[PDB]
Subunit: 147 residues, 3 copies
């Protein structure tokens, strides 16, 4: 409650989430390299790291929706509803990435490399889509904090 | 990686997975209660806890598949193939539980109770299917262990 | 140092402690269920989980007492002293709960249902006393926060 704690907690969440997204991208790049190189044990380690980071991204995206949902109850205006709709789409995308990574992780564990490569590429694309939404949300929040 | 060594590592993973499953069940029961009692914010915390334990169960289920896939490489076939098939099904089921719990967590944050309830009930049912597979897997492994 | 950093730290602590109190309630519910259903290994796990959350509650209560005393020094306030005396009752209560839970853990370990049942019932009751004090504490901090 009180929009100013909410907006400040939001900025902290998004700052932590961006770091997690960067770290996830380093794990993703490492996994792709290990796959190309044929190093299956390395790939397993990098996928497990990626899965861990993705779980944190998902958690932060959940918290982001919850904070903006609260903001919208406190100050029901067009802006608040727009910011919440972006965050809800961000959450949908990151959870779609999580599902796709799960498919890829299972396929690599099973040794089904065609399923793995397809799902892993879908996972990379969804991350890039999530990044676009993340930036959009940041721009909207700039308008809501008003310096 | 001898066969006796792999089988030992498996028994330890499944021991740890069972404890996580007990934690997941307590979190699930608590969420159901908070849901029934209309404690929105309490439910949110219990869903986050369930989601964390679920991700831990999924990681153990991945590790279990990886270990059995390795066991099938040290074998010229055995009841390894059957254990691996069960484990792969267990992983698929627990990942479906993660996917449905994600949907529920998002619907709860979005304030969409119909979508929450449908997904949460799917999550619970997949947990029961996973429990059956986990018990089946333990029974299969006992026959591979030789004491 | 500076009444506002102390207040924001107290805000963070009590928010973290409320989550821990939820986790304690879920473990307690789970132990009760395992006890009623006669699943002694499940019960032993859930008592251990309860004890862990209880001790985390204890630590947050310690930290809250220390922080309120610090606030009383640089922002003397009859609400800060009110909060401190509630926080100190809370600490005494949650410690008492830890003691009775220990008695229950030991009773379960010894397989002594008559000691166990008395200790467990006292533990649940103390947890309720603590929940009430925590509510009062929350309201008092809301007063101090003075919007």
């Amino acid at each position: 409650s009180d929009a100013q704690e909410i907006l400040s907690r939001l900025n902290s969440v998004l700052e932590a989430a961006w770091k997690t997204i960067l770290n996830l991208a380093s794990a993703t790049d490492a996994a792709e390299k290990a796959y190309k190189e044929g190093r299956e044990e390395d790939l397993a380690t990098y996928l497990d790291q990626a899965a861990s980071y993705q779980s944190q991204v998902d958690q932060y995206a959940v918290e982001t929706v919850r904070l903006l949902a609260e903001l919208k109850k406190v100050f029901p205006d067009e802006e608040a509803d727009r910011a919440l709709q972006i965050a809800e789409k961000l959450l949908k995308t990151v959870q779609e990435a999580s599902k796709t990574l799960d498919t890829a992780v299972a396929a690599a564990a099973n040794g089904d490399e065609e399923t793995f490569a397809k799902a892993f590429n879908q996972f990379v694309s969804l991350g890039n889509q999530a990044d676009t939404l993340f930036t959009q949300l940041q721009r909207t929040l700039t308008n809501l904090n008003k310096k």
